[PDB]
Specification:
The chain is mostly beta strands. It has one helix at about 350-355; strands at about 5-10, 20-30, 35-40, 50-60, 70, 80-90, 95-105, 125-130, 140, 155-160, 160, 165, 175-180, 190-195, 205, 215-220, 225-230, 235-245, 255-260, 265-270, 285-290, 295-305, 315-320, 325-330, 335-340, 345-350. It binds 2-deoxy-2,3-dehydro-N-acetyl-neuraminic acid. 2-deoxy-2,3-dehydro-N-acetyl-neuraminic acid (DAN) binds near residues 46, 108 and 109. It catalyses: Hydrolysis of alpha-(2->3)-, alpha-(2->6)-, alpha-(2->8)- glycosidic linkages of terminal sialic acid residues in oligosaccharides, glycoproteins, glycolipids, colominic acid and synthetic substrates.
Length: about 350
């Protein structure tokens, strides 16, 4: 077809109530509405800043966006509370939407102490907001205790963006959301948090790697779950691991030289999420990140047609400043992209024809 690439800002620093906006999360409701979530930052900083989780909705495929509404409101007055780094997760079977995020008080990620008590202001808590009405109203839950099987895990945070629901195998229906934890030795590890009962209970899998950070997972054509991670040890590339199970454990972590990265968040999705297992279309992956190894710039989309082995097609969508980016498959066959150009958060829409390879 004919190449399509358009973009418009959803939030710009200083307008609509907050001096700074950051951290994109994007998803599509079962009704087909597009939901964009991000941080509203009063002091322009990460947790423990008294941040708010915000949301904008589009009912016409991303063309027009409704007003900025608050999902979780931070408290700028003492007792200070903050809510940051959103990640959406839609249970396509039940139609339920989840929005995972941090619940901070006195500490952020690096400073969190061990503990699980919601009342303890020294721990960085894990929260989930649940909606059964398409993202209109939300019910909140602190699940730190449920996802901390090892008392030595002193900190954690859901990787911002969008999680997944498995379609194949013995664990089909399973909701997976990635987290980064800091263990007793001070090591940064990746871990899958999942639910087999459509969100009633959440539990952690086995932690993997060292030098890990914000990480994402995708279900491959054979049902294997590929983990793609930001490298906190700064190799200049993305780290990768694979899981063949559901009681999540991942194999060894290796550096992927095909994916340069300056130690920043990225997104990896299935181009055709509904394709049947083993089919050619099920092997197609899209990846968005900053390709520069020296700075957060040169935002590009890469495409693989072999479950992530090779990435023969790539195109730059933002030559300049580009930090965090997330992708989702829209029902019209195109792709939504929420990203950070340095001025707040911007929404972009593109199709495969635009990519050039196919
Ligand atoms: C909970 C939290 O702190 N999230 C932040 C995250 C984290 O600090 C880093 O991943 C090192 O672990 O990094 C950044 C960043 O732009 O680099 C922004 C996130 O809001």
């Amino acid at each position: 077809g004919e190449p399509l690439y358009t973009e418009q800002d959803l939030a710009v620093n200083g307008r609509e109530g907050f001096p700074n906006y950051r951290i994109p999360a994007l998803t599509v409701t079962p009704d087909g509405d597009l939901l964009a979530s991000y941080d509203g930052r009063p002091t322009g900083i990460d947790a423990p800043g008294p941040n708010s989780i915000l949301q904008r909705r589009s009912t016409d495929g991303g063309r027009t966006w409704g007003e900025q509404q608050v999902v979780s409101a931070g408290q700028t007055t003492a007792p200070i509370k903050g809510f940051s780094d959103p990640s959406y997760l839609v249970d396509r079977e039940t139609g339920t939407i989840f929005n995972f995020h941090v619940y901070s008080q006195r500490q952020g990620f690096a400073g969190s102490r061990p503990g699980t008590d919601p009342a303890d202001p020294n721990v960085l808590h894990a929260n989930v907001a649940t909606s059964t009405d398409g993202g209109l109203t939300w019910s909140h839950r602190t699940i730190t205790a449920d996802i901390t099987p090892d008392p030595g895990w002193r900190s954690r945070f859901a990787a911002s963006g969008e999680g997944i629901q498995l379609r194949y195998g013995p664990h089909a229906g399973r909701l997976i959301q990635q987290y980064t934890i800091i263990n007793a030795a001070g090591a940064f590890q990746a871990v899958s948090v999942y639910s087999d009962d459509h969100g009633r209970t959440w539990r952690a899998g086995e932690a993997v790697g060292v030098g890990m950070d914000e990480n994402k997972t995708v279900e491959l054509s054979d049902g294997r779950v590929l983990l793609n991670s930001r490298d906190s040890a700064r190799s200049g590339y993305r780290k990768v691991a694979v899981s063949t199970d559901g009681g999540h454990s991942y194999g060894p972590v290796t550096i992927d030289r095909d994916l340069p990265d300056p130690t920043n968040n990225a997104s990896i999705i299935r181009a055709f999420p509904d394709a049947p297992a083993g089919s050619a279309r099920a092997k197609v992956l899209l990846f968005s990140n900053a390709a520069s190894q020296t700075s957060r710039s040169q935002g590009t989309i890469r495409m693989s047609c072999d479950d992530g082995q090779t990435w023969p097609v790539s195109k730059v969508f933002q030559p300049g400043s580009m930090s965090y980016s997330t992708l989702t498959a829209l029902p019209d066959g195109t792709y939504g992209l929420l990203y950070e150009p340095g001025t707040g958060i911007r929404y972009a829409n593109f199709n495969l024809a635009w990519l050039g390879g196919i």
